[PDB]
From Swiss-Prot:
EC number, as in UniProt: 3.6.1.-, 3.6.1.77
Protein name: Peroxisomal coenzyme A diphosphatase NUDT7
Catalytic activity: hexanoyl-CoA + H2O = hexanoyl-4'-phosphopantetheine + adenosine 3',5'-bisphosphate + 2 H(+); octanoyl-CoA + H2O = S-octanoyl-4'-phosphopantetheine + adenosine 3',5'-bisphosphate + 2 H(+); butanoyl-CoA + H2O = S-butanoyl-4'-phosphopantetheine + adenosine 3',5'-bisphosphate + 2 H(+); decanoyl-CoA + H2O = decanoyl-4'-phosphopantetheine + adenosine 3',5'-bisphosphate + 2 H(+)
Species per Swiss-Prot/TrEMBL record: Homo sapiens
Full-sequence range covered: 14 to 209 of 238
UniProt record, GO biological process: acetyl-CoA catabolic process; brown fat cell differentiation; butyryl-CoA catabolic process; coenzyme A catabolic process; malonyl-CoA catabolic process; medium-chain fatty-acyl-CoA catabolic process; nucleoside diphosphate metabolic process; propionyl-CoA catabolic process
Positions that bind Mg(2+): 79, 83
Compartment(s) where it occurs, according to its Swiss-Prot or TrEMBL record: Peroxisome
Annotated function: Fatty acyl-coenzyme A (CoA) diphosphatase that hydrolyzes fatty acyl-CoA to yield acyl-4'-phosphopantetheine and adenosine 3',5'-bisphosphate. Cleaves CoA, CoA esters and oxidized CoA with similar efficiencies. Preferentially hydrolyzes medium-chain acyl-CoAs and bile acid-CoAs. Has no activity toward NDP-sugars, CDP-alcohols, (deoxy)nucleoside 5'-triphosphates, nucleoside 5'-di or monophosphates, diadenosine polyphosphates, NAD, NADH, NADP, NADPH or thymidine-5'-monophospho-p-nitrophenyl ester.
Amino acid sequence: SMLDDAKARLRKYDIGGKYSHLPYNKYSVLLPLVAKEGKLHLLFTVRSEKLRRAPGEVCFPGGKRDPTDMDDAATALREAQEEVGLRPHQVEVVCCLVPCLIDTDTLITPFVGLIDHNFQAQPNPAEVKDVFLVPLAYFLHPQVHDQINHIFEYTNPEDGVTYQIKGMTANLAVLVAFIILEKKPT
Ligand SMILES: O=C1CC=CN1c1ccccc1-c1cccc(C(F)(F)F)c1
């Protein structure tokens, strides 16, 4: 099926816990896959304007590891729960993709999670100003603006709202799209 096929593809790129004991400042992000209307979508947040890091920016759910987290995946789930109400039984963590090195002292580990069809985002306004889906296929033929560096613009056809997606977030979205959608029959 569509979902089993996605998980089978994602597993081939799983690095596991290989880079997890390294002594960095550690953050995790969840790349949440949602199936609507026969297609895969990614769930994104727009960070609250109030926040320390990256106010107002499109990001995946995630944040800093803390001492309660059993591992790096748990960081991602905890933070996703706090930001959009995603509960443990509503997500299956399928793999750990390549970490992202930032600022010489920081490692951000991304996990891809399959999201239950009955989950409905409950944006927490202290963390998140908005939550939106983008079809995964969009990342194969994005609308690119050069700001010099590359920015994606996605317009939700439901309401005409335009979102700007950039940096690590845009990079990880392209990666997931390539992994799951490359070389597929129609
Ligand atoms: O400034 C940027 C741009 C993209 C990564 N950084 C970060 C840089 C340093 C530390 C953390 C981060 C970060 C910034 C924002 C959300 C997160 C997250 F992991 F919590 F989601 C992590």
